Amino acid sequence: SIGVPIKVLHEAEGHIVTCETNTGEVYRGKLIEAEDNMNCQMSNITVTYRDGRVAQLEQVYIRGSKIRFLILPDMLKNAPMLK
Amino acid sequence: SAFDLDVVKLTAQFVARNGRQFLTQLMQKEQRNYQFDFLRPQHSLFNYFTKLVEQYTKILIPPKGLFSKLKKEAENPREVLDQVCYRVEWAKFQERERKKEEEEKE
Amino acid sequence: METILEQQRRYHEEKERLMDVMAKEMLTKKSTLRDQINSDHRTRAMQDRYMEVSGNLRDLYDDKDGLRKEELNAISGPNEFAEFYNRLKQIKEFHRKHPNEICVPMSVEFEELLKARENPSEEAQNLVEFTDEEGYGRYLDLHDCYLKYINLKASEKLDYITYLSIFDQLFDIPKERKNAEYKRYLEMLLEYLQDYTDRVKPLQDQNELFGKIQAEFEKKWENGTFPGWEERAQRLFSTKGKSLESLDTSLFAKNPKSKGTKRDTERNKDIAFLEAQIYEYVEILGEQRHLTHENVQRKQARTGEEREEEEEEKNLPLGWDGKPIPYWLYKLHGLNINYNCEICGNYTYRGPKAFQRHFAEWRHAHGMRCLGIPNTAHFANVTQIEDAVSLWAKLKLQKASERWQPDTEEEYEDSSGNVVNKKTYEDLKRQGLL
Amino acid sequence: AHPPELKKFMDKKLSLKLNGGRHVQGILRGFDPFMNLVIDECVEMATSGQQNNIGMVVIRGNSIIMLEALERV
Amino acid sequence: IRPNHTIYINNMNDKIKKEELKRSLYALFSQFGHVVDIVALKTMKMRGQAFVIFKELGSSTNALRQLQGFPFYGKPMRIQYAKTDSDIISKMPNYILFLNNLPEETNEMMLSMLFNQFPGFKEVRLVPGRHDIAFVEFENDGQAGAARDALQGFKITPSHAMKITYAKK
Amino acid sequence: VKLTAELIEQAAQYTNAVRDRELDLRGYKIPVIENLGATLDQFDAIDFSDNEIRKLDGFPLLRRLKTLLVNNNRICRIGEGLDQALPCLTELILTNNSLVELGDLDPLASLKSLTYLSILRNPVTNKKHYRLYVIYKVPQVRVLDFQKVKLKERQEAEKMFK
Amino acid sequence: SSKMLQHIDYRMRCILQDGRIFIGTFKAFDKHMNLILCDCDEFRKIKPKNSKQAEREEKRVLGLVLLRGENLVSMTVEGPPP
Amino acid sequence: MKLVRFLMKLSHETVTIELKNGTQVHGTITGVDVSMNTHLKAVKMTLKNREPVQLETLSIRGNNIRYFILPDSLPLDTLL
RNA sequence: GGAUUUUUGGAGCAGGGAGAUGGAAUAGGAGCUUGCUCCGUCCACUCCACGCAUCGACCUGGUAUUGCAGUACCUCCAGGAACGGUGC
């Protein structure tokens, strides 16, 4: 089936997320396009790679096997998942 | 009346310094131009005066804290259990005595 | 700052209430073993409250030794009396009462309604110090001890029977080394047993008992506690003998016994003391250890349903003749049919007869009272609460329409010839203008 | 089995970060629903400023950490 | 200007970072009332200034009247009501006083917002007979007193000042 | 009105405007400060505004304290052993209280992470060399009462009070 | 049994796969149990590298974080239901 | 026959699991499922070079668990 | 339904050298307590390649802004580094 955390990441698509991948990479930016395989093609992201220098680049693509975490918009606290 | 309670406590503290039934710290203060109708024996406040006096005596006796220290109470589970069972035993004796009185009244 | 009197009075009241509460708890009974353990800890706590009051009282003589001079005067008096009155002539107009002078320590050292708790005693119990396999004094905490015996021994020929036969003896032959980490493991296991004994006995004078036990270890075990007929005496921790008591005393002052070995009298004193505490707890709670052994045997050999359950702790209508009515009469009356009244707490009725009566039957009357909608005719046969609400709203609007509110319609012209409703009319009438 | 949304990233210059700290810039041409890629003119720069282009490489989605596209495609 | 939950404050230090700035604003506004949210940016559109959202218009007004020109990060900053509603609150003596010198052009909506600034009043009666007058009653006499002391000399359509007095018996 | 555990369980614990895990007491008037342990360390800020708190003491053992709001208080004096219970507590919103004496903040030096405080509208704020004793006896604090501590004022605070 | 649904809606401190933590009110779940932490706190270790300096655990604001199944290891229950 | 039902046939028996994060958790685990999904209940867990932490409701993962330790008086024939 | 994107795992490993520098109140073995000597776990300072470079806040001064907004982080110089972690 389809997982409700993944549905919340879909509800957070388009808008800005703040994800962290396997290498500590913190990408804070608009997560545009994503899949149920957690392969999210995003844009307008400040990707830091955990070194402190975040660079503001376009059209990044972060998978999910590396995904440590991903902050999704708080306004989704009224998303249909939790209620 | 908190002020009245404090005043009765002060009267008991002055009656713990009384030397005789007449010469103490309350005699002159009774008629010394201040209101004190609590020394009268019929007003229920004389019971609070007398109970404050009884506590003042049980605390101003030699073991009450005057010149010695009692430690079988301050470190004594043995004395605690003894005295507690003894209060329960006086309670049991009084229970049997009240039952006897009730049977006699019947 | 009268210390001679005020401290004595406070301590006396607190101690009277504490002794009274303890004596009441020990003159009544608790019905459960959990009640028993909680109340025993509480009785130790009441004795400790009395003890703290007494320890604060028996030291407050640094002011009394000098106040015996000041309070022993029969010459002064009414002067200081009038002065205390001059201070006590502040406003006491807080015209109310409060008994919080002499009635508090009853609710400080007394019992509770559903579980014996005073003011402080609301969280005192064996809840955080009781094992489930224990029961507040029925079983022990030794499963981890068996697991540690296994992780130490590395053998599958050690079960509950061998564990009990090895750990019951006080000074019986060790099956595991008191020269290896087996001594530390036994110290830890006897520590768990000593914790059981320290939580199970809060009415024993623990300080005096521990001091007597230390004096025992310092006097009677190191002074030939196991007599005999080399064979005169041997050491429990040293693993060395003596030709006699003289040889023992002359070799306890020898060189190799003091520091010339890892099993000497200085580096092994803690291990000897732990072995002693373990053997002493076992030989004292042999009836407790015996109850635990009988438990283990029955809980290991008994049946599974009872074992798990002990570890965890037609329909016809009834006729006028108390009999079930005929199936055909049932079918005719349509009772099999289930009608849900939600407003009634998702109640269910059998029979359309009962269902229709149900709107004037009590439980629906309440349900609608709770909703805030009168159980009137209009809502009969409505069951869903959202529907009842909505309908109540449109009915509110209806009756509001047909009602006559003078305040809103009755139109009043002012002396200036323009119209207000009578509300504003009287408003600005008495408001100085109209 | 799902294919990715890689048809837009097709024919784009992409700087991707692969595992081991690797940085490969290359052209996406067509991929497999497992994101199994083949990158044209793929130049994978070592930890240092030295880089090399290797043309045709079937790269891992197990080793690719992330990827970026420098054009709007 | 009207009572809103957001209390704006301008002319704070720009040598003070936004994080410690919102920390100190929360600290100084918790003593005023319920700090629900804080809208503070560090870009030149709203740099050096911040609006802290109170869970009460009474609380934000309290902070604005207590800390008017408040010593705050090197130079006293100026605190007042937000121009409009914040995003937080957006997602969230007598009984009656007579208003005089009121505009015969005034709007009932703004009049109701004004009379309800103090906890929601009963009603306002803009008299269609004798013009330039109102009679407004309150669901609370305390709010009535507050709003009437504020309204004696009230400024709405500043071409006049409308005054609220204890309406006679 | 005794301070109890109902006025703890009905309280709000959330992530407030300062991204701190705050427990709030709206309308408490609690003059007894104790028994906050079941706060469960999911909180870093403790606000108890509108309180009749007569003294600054009586707090339990938490490792992650971040803000303490004693705002709108009635404190007479301050207890000492706040430091072992607040290891790294940094912000203290302690205005509108009856602090007067230079010895009313003597336990303040035990705060290791102290960074900011507000004690305004108190008889202790108006005194001369008051911020001197402040920036001396709290050596760690770099800002207090909405103004940073400075090298010159710090040198003056060292020179005085000797 | 999908057991987690009985302890959900209340606050738990989960672990990461790298020794860190994520404390929050668990919102919703999936098959792979990748978590959805609301107003999450990320309490991680700070490398001491010394015995003369302490060991601290600083937590930043994550908000609503959708932690992957590569991070969900073990999650104790520590908070009341908000 | 995979170990699915060998792991899942367990409830609230004092066992000792080893999580692949260098940690151990012993206690009465609540319930196990088919894919090595087991929760913890009132469990005592020791981490890598750490303290005997207590968990009232901890949710142990499956492949992040390195091994299991059953009771000593349990017939593995009757368990698997 | 353990073979690249979530739970039958690519995890685990240890912290650069050296100097007639110090410490193990309570814990080391040997020379069969103490006195002295050796050796296999750190820290504190001092030497080298202050482990370096990068950057994100951060402490101090000076330095600009007066600016109505739903927020990765926002003026700039300089440092001394109290921190996070990256490439070797």
UniProtKB/Swiss-Prot annotation, chain C:
<dbReference type="GO" id="GO:0000398">
    <property type="term" value="P:mRNA splicing, via spliceosome"/>
</dbReference>
<keyword id="KW-0539">Nucleus</keyword>
<keyword id="KW-0508">mRNA splicing</keyword>
<dbReference type="GO" id="GO:1903241">
    <property type="term" value="P:U2-type prespliceosome assembly"/>
</dbReference>
<dbReference type="GO" id="GO:0000389">
    <property type="term" value="P:mRNA 3'-splice site recognition"/>
</dbReference>
<feature type="compositionally biased region" description="Basic and acidic residues">
    <location>
        <begin position="294"/>
        <end position="305"/>
    </location>
</feature>
<dbReference type="Pfam" id="PF12108">
    <property type="entry name" value="SF3a60_bindingd"/>
</dbReference>
<dbReference type="InterPro" id="IPR031774">
    <property type="entry name" value="SF3A3_dom"/>
</dbReference>
<keyword id="KW-0747">Spliceosome</keyword>
<dbReference type="GO" id="GO:0000375">
    <property type="term" value="P:RNA splicing, via transesterification reactions"/>
</dbReference>
<feature type="modified residue" description="Phosphoserine">
    <location>
        <position position="246"/>
    </location>
</feature>
<keyword id="KW-0007">Acetylation</keyword>
Curated annotation (Swiss-Prot), chain D:
<dbReference type="GO" id="GO:0071007">
    <property type="term" value="C:U2-type catalytic step 2 spliceosome"/>
</dbReference>
<comment type="function">
    <text>Plays a role in pre-mRNA splicing as a core component of the spliceosomal U1, U2, U4 and U5 small nuclear ribonucleoproteins (snRNPs), the building blocks of the spliceosome. Component of both the pre-catalytic spliceosome B complex and activated spliceosome C complexes. As a component of the minor spliceosome, involved in the splicing of U12-type introns in pre-mRNAs. As part of the U7 snRNP it is involved in histone 3'-end processing.</text>
</comment>
<keyword id="KW-0507">mRNA processing</keyword>
<dbReference type="GO" id="GO:0008380">
    <property type="term" value="P:RNA splicing"/>
</dbReference>
<dbReference type="GO" id="GO:0005689">
    <property type="term" value="C:U12-type spliceosomal complex"/>
</dbReference>
<keyword id="KW-0694">RNA-binding</keyword>
<dbReference type="GO" id="GO:0071005">
    <property type="term" value="C:U2-type precatalytic spliceosome"/>
</dbReference>
<comment type="similarity">
    <text>Belongs to the snRNP Sm proteins family.</text>
</comment>
<feature type="domain" description="Sm">
    <location>
        <begin position="1"/>
        <end position="73"/>
    </location>
</feature>
<dbReference type="GO" id="GO:0005684">
    <property type="term" value="C:U2-type spliceosomal complex"/>
</dbReference>
<protein>
    <recommendedName>
        <fullName>Small nuclear ribonucleoprotein G</fullName>
    </recommendedName>
</protein>
<dbReference type="GO" id="GO:0005682">
    <property type="term" value="C:U5 snRNP"/>
</dbReference>
Curated annotation (Swiss-Prot), chain E:
<keyword id="KW-0507">mRNA processing</keyword>
<dbReference type="InterPro" id="IPR035979">
    <property type="entry name" value="RBD_domain_sf"/>
</dbReference>
<dbReference type="GO" id="GO:0005654">
    <property type="term" value="C:nucleoplasm"/>
</dbReference>
<dbReference type="GO" id="GO:0005681">
    <property type="term" value="C:spliceosomal complex"/>
</dbReference>
<comment type="subunit">
    <text>Identified in the spliceosome B complex. Identified in the spliceosome C complex. Present in a spliceosome complex assembled in vitro, and composed of SNRPB2, HPRP8BP and CRNKL1. Contributes to the binding of stem loop IV of U2 snRNA with SNRPP1.</text>
</comment>
<keyword id="KW-0007">Acetylation</keyword>
<feature type="domain" description="RRM 1">
    <location>
        <begin position="5"/>
        <end position="84"/>
    </location>
</feature>
<dbReference type="GO" id="GO:0071007">
    <property type="term" value="C:U2-type catalytic step 2 spliceosome"/>
</dbReference>
<protein>
    <recommendedName>
        <fullName>U2 small nuclear ribonucleoprotein B''</fullName>
    </recommendedName>
</protein>
<keyword id="KW-0694">RNA-binding</keyword>
<comment type="similarity">
    <text>Belongs to the RRM U1 A/B'' family.</text>
</comment>
<comment type="function">
    <text>Involved in pre-mRNA splicing as component of the spliceosome. Associated with sn-RNP U2, where it contributes to the binding of stem loop IV of U2 snRNA.</text>
</comment>
Swiss-Prot record, chain G:
<protein>
    <recommendedName>
        <fullName>Small nuclear ribonucleoprotein-associated proteins B and B'</fullName>
    </recommendedName>
</protein>
<comment type="similarity">
    <text>Belongs to the snRNP SmB/SmN family.</text>
</comment>
<comment type="function">
    <text>Plays a role in pre-mRNA splicing as a core component of the spliceosomal U1, U2, U4 and U5 small nuclear ribonucleoproteins (snRNPs), the building blocks of the spliceosome. Component of both the pre-catalytic spliceosome B complex and activated spliceosome C complexes. As a component of the minor spliceosome, involved in the splicing of U12-type introns in pre-mRNAs. As part of the U7 snRNP it is involved in histone pre-mRNA 3'-end processing.</text>
</comment>
<comment type="subunit">
    <text>Core component of the spliceosomal U1, U2, U4 and U5 small nuclear ribonucleoproteins (snRNPs), the building blocks of the spliceosome. Most spliceosomal snRNPs contain a common set of Sm proteins, SNRPB, SNRPD1, SNRPD2, SNRPD3, SNRPE, SNRPF and SNRPG that assemble in a heptameric protein ring on the Sm site of the small nuclear RNA to form the core snRNP. Component of the U1 snRNP. The U1 snRNP is composed of the U1 snRNA and the 7 core Sm proteins SNRPB, SNRPD1, SNRPD2, SNRPD3, SNRPE, SNRPF and SNRPG, and at least three U1 snRNP-specific proteins SNRNP70/U1-70K, SNRPA/U1-A and SNRPC/U1-C.</text>
</comment>
<feature type="domain" description="Sm">
    <location>
        <begin position="1"/>
        <end position="81"/>
    </location>
</feature>
